[PDB]
Symmetry: D2
Subunit: 414 residues, 4 copies
């Protein structure tokens, strides 16, 4: 992480002080559970009330121990009598503490992500509603195809971020775990009863099969969801960048006029996407555990959450402040009439007994397009029918016909 994009409350979660604070919370959870066995009652409460987190001291100890968790434990134990600290870190392996505390950091980080993802959805739906009745040229291969609702662009992103929001809420309900299973998930000293009591104190479920570590596919699953979110961010950023260009000029980022925010967000999306492979590779641990995932996690996890929160907040503000240039958007529809050939062709195919090439050759052969067309049938083919006017109001009625249904099905409230 760098200062330019640092969200303070997110970096605080991953800072050494909170890292040790969460490990301490996990230590005291199992210590309190063990008060039902050999630990004197009140011990955990006593340590909780006094224990200080001292990262510089931990660092100093680690220079000698060459082991960060031993250094952490030493930094806590040296604040209490030998008697009070006796059962601190008893029966657990270091990673029981590390991985359980890690879940706490992830849990707290997810809370911010989810809040900011909801906020972004709300902004997109607001924008979609605001522009729902603006008619614009839909484009395929970058080429004009048919008119459509401009608002449907924002609604399309809205429903995609909503899909991701459901994924995250599903993971929040069921995703994270803790473990107090000892050296290799074998419960030499601890019991599954101790572990369950500690887990209940922390408010998370127990890993079904832990080893020395919690299996890394849980993290990988979350990071995968974040990868899909990165694609949603990038697709929306790219849409805005396209509409922003001088040639199109249908929107501009609110504040010489450049899409610098959505370009920035494209870069953020690339970063988030690059973490997916790391998380997948960190799963392939040797036997009951290898520590290779540790150094990688120290880099990418704080960055992943920090970039994710930064990006969702920046995208929300960009959407809120985006200027939509209605007249430019709609004049472009006015300026193009090519799509109408297919409309009339279909209309004839549907309302007359003639075939494609026949209906085609007529429309092709052919001031109101509708009028002269309807005149031709009566005059030559002696067929009479009420061909709808295609003037701009008729074009809107035609190409925005189902927009209310599309919004209804996309939004839970409607």
């Amino acid at each position: 992480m760098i200062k330019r994009y640092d969200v303070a409350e997110i970096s605080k979660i991953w800072a050494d002080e909170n890292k040790y604070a969460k490990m301490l919370e996990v230590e005291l959870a199992i210590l309190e559970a063990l008060e039902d066995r050999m630990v004197p009652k009140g011990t955990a409460a006593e340590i909780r009330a006094r224990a200080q987190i001292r990262p510089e001291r931990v660092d100093e100890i680690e220079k000698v121990t060459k082991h960060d968790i031993i250094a952490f434990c030493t930094s806590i134990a040296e604040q209490f009598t030998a008697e009070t600290g006796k059962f601190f870190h008893f029966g657990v392996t270091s990673s029981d503490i590390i991985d359980s505390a890690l879940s706490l950091q992830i849990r707290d980080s997810m809370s911010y992500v989810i809040k900011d993802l909801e906020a972004l959805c709300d902004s997109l739906l607001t924008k979609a509603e605001e522009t729902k009745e603006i008619i614009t040229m839909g484009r395929s291969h970058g080429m004009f195809a048919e008119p459509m609702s401009f608002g449907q662009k924002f609604l399309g992103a809205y429903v995609e971020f909503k899909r991701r929001l459901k994924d995250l809420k599903d993971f929040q309900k069921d995703g994270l775990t803790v473990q107090f299973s000892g050296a290799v998930g074998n419960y030499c000293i601890l019991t599954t009863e101790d572990e369950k009591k500690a887990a209940d104190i922390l408010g998370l479920p127990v890993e079904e099969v832990s080893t020395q570590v919690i299996p890394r596919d849980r993290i990988a699953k979350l990071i995968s969801i974040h990868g899909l979110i990165a694609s949603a961010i990038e697709r929306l950023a790219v849409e805005i960048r396209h509409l922003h260009r001088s040639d199109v000029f249908e929107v501009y980022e609110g504040f010489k006029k450049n899409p610098i925010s959505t370009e920035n967000l494209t870069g953020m999306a690339r970063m988030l996407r690059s973490h997916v492979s790391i998380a997948l590779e960190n799963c392939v641990l040797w036997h009951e555990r290898d520590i290779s995932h540790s150094s990688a996690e120290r880099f990418y996890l704080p960055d992943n959450f920090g970039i994710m929160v930064y990006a969702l907040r920046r995208m929300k503000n960009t959407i809120d402040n985006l200027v939509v240039q209605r007249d430019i958007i709609e004049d472009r529809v006015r300026s193009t009439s090519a799509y109408l050939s297919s409309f009339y062709l279909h209309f004839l195919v549907a309302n007359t007994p003639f075939m494609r090439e026949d209906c085609y050759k007529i429309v092709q052969q052919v001031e109101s397009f509708s009028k002269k067309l309807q005149k031709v049938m009566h005059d030559e083919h002696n067929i009479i029918l009420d061909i709808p006017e295609m003037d701009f109001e008729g074009i809107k009625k035609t190409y925005l016909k189902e927009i209310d249904h599309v919004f209804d099905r996309s939004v839970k409230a409607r």
Copy 2:
């Protein structure tokens, strides 16, 4: 895909003949829905009863049209009277047909994957139960740590594949969609009523916001799940490869003895993992669609399903036929006594009022380890306690104490 690893029923799903057959099914679904409007009743049934799939003819037409869907439509229409074929491919855009048919191919492919993933879980649980009472050395950093249940290695993989199985079943219940929304999801000719009727015929839900295409994050989500499955396969393959090596020799692949199957599966896992980025990048389509995803999907999707099914079946057979060398596994536990220091140290800490270094210095200072230890306390410290025998039977009782609970919580039936 190559012949060496080709699973026939999977490649058949993605072969041109089934590709066109599914597009035909989708065409007839919307055609039948339109019989509630302008299409004569019985039209879809009439075409269904006669239409032939002719891939060589499609290819021949595409040389002229330069458009595969137009070529496909032409190959169907030229089999019927101009009257019967009149409303074939009416109101839809090409990708309404393509993407909806694609969902059908994915759906049918997923059915095989899910069946083979369930089979692999069953095999792993069977293997875990068979080896549950075999004691082995747990290893951290590749180094002996503490004894544990050998079966817990297979149970660990079992629960991970089970997590993936839930993910896939969740996607199967809710993941795939169809669309009949026209050129840019704007319903110029079709109605949402037509689309819903067609979707009901196909048995899939309607995309909330489609453009010209179905948004590619649905595919990306599935491919992401397959990526996590690849990590599960690789972690299990690596475990087997480790236990298979000449130095350890705790298992061998059933049939000079080499872990060639799990090595093969490691390569398959790499392939599956490489597809994740493709699927994520295919999401970032321009405006209402760009066709760039198409060529990539033509390569990686048939390969992804083909490799996935091949790999899950090969892993199942390898697990079933794996030879577990019990005496080698257990003699290794017998051959090591280092882990016991921590046991006794903890035992003393827990059952006496002495402190770590004191309990440490004793165990360190110290034929039954238990006996002489228990003798020392009575003789010198005048403390009396029933120190459990650590002989091999006692070691098993100690380090497999919670194994029944671990299996119980991991398996729904127990």
Copy 3:
């Protein structure tokens, strides 16, 4: 690989028949070398003249053996007397044969990639020279900036593809190797002299340190170059797709009008890029070798070369056939005058004692008040400030003179022999 994109001569190289033909050539290279020792003179030549490649037969034998090289060797040996086939596959490990033959397949595949990459370079420069004279609006963040030469767009792709062409030609000179080192690179039966003779017959250098296998970082290096080419393909494809859109419409793909080819090629680029991680992971083999890389290579290597050749040829044809719409391009330059303020600002800064903030209001003054921008500004300068200036006329011709001033130099430094006198 699929039929839709299959380039016949590339898939043929990776087809079972050529795979075994290259294995045979490698087996006969070491066998001929060994004729300097224990093998009767003429043995390799005898087998070379008669042996048939029978992929079908290899398959049925492989059903029994569970080992493809044993199956291949048996398919050869069974065509000869027990005596003649005696020293076939002697001293080598299976992967001495597999990996050395794989180098031959990669070598022949590279020949096609290099020919097609150079041809794409040629077509890009042809397009650059053809359009060097055309003035277009340069764009940053998609927003109009300053006019530039349209040909510089193609020349920018040219130089990038030439950087890749040099990388490939460098690898061609020094990248591929062979090995005849035995089970774990230890030469139990074979000697380094045998290995060297056999390598000389094949025309490739000997791997410095081999194991059972040739190390996979050589393949990974080549695939990494192909990954960089994929970025070049994508950058150029995206440029064409941008220029092809209805809003800009400065080019169209030749032969309703869509950039379907450059979209296809964007897909191809994603595929090529996906292989890089596979190649890098395939490097991490256990000890003296483990066969995990094999299944992976059977999928991605023929696809990588097949897609690369397909994409380079299709992109070249797309560039050749691209229609450049000059009047649309240059009219867009005419329709925009905003960039001129920076020109005039710099002009006043460089030619008056005034300071930037002053010069900026003056230019902002004339611009909103006011028709020749130059002559009017020139008027005020003398009139308001008594300053004598020769401000060049910024009409279309002057604008072209200004913003394409150095285009000759850029072309000359970008193309090696261009700008040298040759005759």
Copy 4:
């Protein structure tokens, strides 16, 4: 980057203070060039002697401007008279400065990577020479195969890291460039002569075709090389982790005994490998540029260089301090005799008129019946078949003679001057 792995001299290069100091050097290079035109002689030297780098001040200004280069320029200009600062940042576009200065940061970072990569090569060869004499079991699929030199494990890593060192030194000679081409590479105000003079002051070549930006494939090429190095780091780390495990125990990391360092470095390799895709994607910029690559580069470039330098130094120290357990290694060779059958099979094939299938039963006969394998087989050959052979004794010393026969040649061809007479 995090404090735990932060190498001070590398993070300093990427710290705001040096970022702006390099921007200043680039600004003054073009300013000095422009003294041959409109800028009064001495101006660049005046600013060079006095200008202070004030990252703090840049930040407060950037709060207003929303533009980091305007903020930087303003931080410099406000230290001087309006006159002296008049031609500061004249004619250039912001990215002429940013990208040229970025090349200077990359150049200085490369110097450290190259020094540390060569030092790791040195340490690996030192380990290879020290252990060249030790006989170990080679392993394929993790299964015992044939004995080999233990030193060849380290030599195999050596040659791979040397392949990467050559790639980096090649890029160092020809990889980085600078640009002074203006808004879209079009030279509205600047000339190619100005650009060339400024580039000569900086000591880097001019980009052949620049846009607003220098094309990102140069960065991607370097990052791709770093990705290949990451595979080399991982392959070596995994080898040590395998040999360190309790079951094998042939080495341990020097200073309870764990391969914690090589596990850490495996993590570092995964990180380096993750950056390759970022670099490749950053190539695909829209038209004459789009700033999406910027935020990405601010994260991954300092991390890439920081991790690379950290990993190369830590791996070197780990190799230097690695304890090789010779008696364990060689006793394992003594404990295995299976490989000898292939030796004897080949011996009989090469030295008798008998055919393979016959020779195989003979070797299988002596092996199960029977103590010197050689002399006993030699007995049967004369006794059973009346054949006269000098079968070498396959005791420990003979086994060493056989399976390390060519080790001198492998070392000599792997190390350039090794095996040349020098004095």
